[PDB]
Amino acid sequence: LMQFTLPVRLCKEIELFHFDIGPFENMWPGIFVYMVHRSCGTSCFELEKLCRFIMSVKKNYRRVPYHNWKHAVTVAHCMYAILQNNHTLFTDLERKGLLIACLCHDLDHRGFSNSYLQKFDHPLAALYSTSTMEQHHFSQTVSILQLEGHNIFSTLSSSEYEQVLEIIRKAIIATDLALYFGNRKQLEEMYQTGSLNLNNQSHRDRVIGLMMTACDLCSVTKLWPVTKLTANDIYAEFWAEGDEMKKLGIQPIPMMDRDKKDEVPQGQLGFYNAVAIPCYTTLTQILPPTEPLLKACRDNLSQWEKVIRGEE
Ligand SMILES: Cc1nc2ccccc2nc1-c1cc2nc(N3CC[C@@H](F)C3)cc(N(C)C3CCOCC3)n2n1
Ligand SMILES: [Mg+2]
Ligand SMILES: [Zn+2]
């Protein structure tokens, strides 16, 4: 049968946590299939259904600056690297579920936070009172899975199918950064008091949640030019949201105000110290081979410090 392959530089570098999927959009589907085949197997999905699923997922991402198809694939590659470095800790269903979850986790994102949907009074905020966009992303995932010839899970049993959709729902809900803080605090305590148990389903759930945050934030773990240029796409969205907050007569948070451009370097420090570093720290304690993500994050924090000190 038909192994997907990649050019040599990509074949080698795709295995590393810091890999950038590149600017050639038409190669991103092949990169994902390559990752499913190596992390899951050539037998995991019917190639034809998988190809049709990927192309419908792509079409349901919007041309926004950051929360786009390139983010989806980027977040899947970080998951792939985690799974390939922790081969024997994950069930076959988890391998299957989590790459699809990462590809789908921001489906039909519009470039706005949960908070802006609530203040605009968007219909999605009446349908889903918390984790508004994330419940929408899971709903879009199930919609696409139910299109004719798109059910990539059709060969599982009733209960394996319910389990995989449950892995995907939880993984996608965990990408709500509002739930990250409390999830990591709990994982921290469970690990330090030695009560963390990967046979306890509700513990595994928490560990997958943290893996989803880690993959979602993985732009902070890249080569500095990738990090810094991705930061520009993130702020293009934040600042548009700020603009839309001012049109509703609401002063945006500093993060989203384009008048406070000059503070970006310091806001990045806040984010690395409050979110990213503690995320990759706890992840590294639970899964030692993910340590390269913590080290790259620490390297990028020190590049932001250099931007403040005027050395870059
Ligand atoms: C939320 C995010 N997500 C990323 C994901 C990937 C890559 C970079 C990412 N950066 C950010 C990000 C950007 C940013 N800019 C800030 N300021 C304040 C005014 C001006 F100086 C820029 C302040 C913050 N906070 C301190 C956040 C602390 C954690 O909860 C949300 C608030 N953040 N966080
Ligand atoms: Mg999201
Ligand atoms: Zn995301």
Side-chain angles (χ1 to χ4, degrees), residues 66-67 71 105-107 109 114 133-134 137 172 175-177 216:
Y66 178 70
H67 291 97
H71 175 66
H105 79 287
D106 273 325
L107 264 166
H109 206 289
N114 289 341
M133 287 304 307
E134 295 81 17
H137 307 311
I172 286 174
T175 61
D176 179 4
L177 197 62
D216 203 12

Side-chain angles (χ1 to χ4, degrees), residues 167-178:
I167 291 167
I168 294 153
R169 181 181 65 77
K170 282 172 188 160
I172 286 174
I173 299 310
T175 61
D176 179 4
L177 197 62

Side-chain angles (χ1 to χ4, degrees), residues 62-226:
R62 299 200 184 218
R63 276 174 280 100
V64 293
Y66 178 70
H67 291 97
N68 52 46
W69 175 230
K70 188 174 192 174
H71 175 66
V73 182
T74 289
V75 164
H77 159 272
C78 186
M79 181 56 72
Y80 168 77
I82 295 180
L83 292 174
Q84 289 309 253
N85 277 268
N86 298 271
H87 175 69
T88 69
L89 293 180
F90 295 100
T91 76
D92 289 61
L93 277 186
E94 288 165 357
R95 257 176 282 103
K96 255 150 177 176
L98 285 178
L99 293 159
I100 295 294
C102 286
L103 196 73
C104 293
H105 79 287
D106 273 325
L107 264 166
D108 193 30
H109 206 289
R110 332 285 181 99
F112 294 114
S113 69
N114 289 341
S115 151
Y116 174 78
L117 268 80
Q118 299 154 9
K119 298 255 171 48
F120 183 82
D121 207 359
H122 191 287
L124 286 175
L127 187 35
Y128 312 115
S129 18
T130 65
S131 297
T132 302
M133 287 304 307
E134 295 81 17
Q135 301 201 62
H136 183 60
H137 307 311
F138 181 66
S139 182
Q140 298 278 284
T141 306
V142 178
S143 283
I144 291 183
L145 276 175
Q146 291 174 172
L147 300 171
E148 292 248 306
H150 287 56
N151 209 298
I152 61 170
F153 295 123
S154 71
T155 76
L156 313 185
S157 54
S158 291
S159 87
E160 282 187 297
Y161 186 99
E162 171 133 34
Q163 288 179 76
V164 83
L165 266 294
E166 199 57 24
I167 291 167
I168 294 153
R169 181 181 65 77
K170 282 172 188 160
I172 286 174
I173 299 310
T175 61
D176 179 4
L177 197 62
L179 303 172
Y180 152 70
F181 295 94
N183 188 52
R184 195 211 51 105
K185 279 171 202 135
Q186 289 292 111
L187 277 175
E188 209 194 16
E189 290 182 31
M190 277 163 203
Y191 164 90
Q192 288 170 354
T193 71
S195 35
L196 187 57
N197 177 17
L198 308 193
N199 287 322
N200 179 326
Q201 183 59 56
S202 96
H203 284 188
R204 292 183 86 60
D205 287 355
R206 294 205 169 274
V207 171
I208 292 161
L210 188 66
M211 292 164 55
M212 297 291 303
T213 305
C215 295
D216 203 12
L217 297 197
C218 75
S219 94
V220 303
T221 72
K222 301 305 180 185
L223 216 65
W224 166 246
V226 181

Side-chain angles (χ1 to χ4, degrees), residues 274-291:
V275 184
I277 302 297
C279 178
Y280 293 116
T281 299
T282 302
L283 184 66
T284 300
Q285 297 167 181
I286 301 167
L287 301 181
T290 66
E291 193 183 17

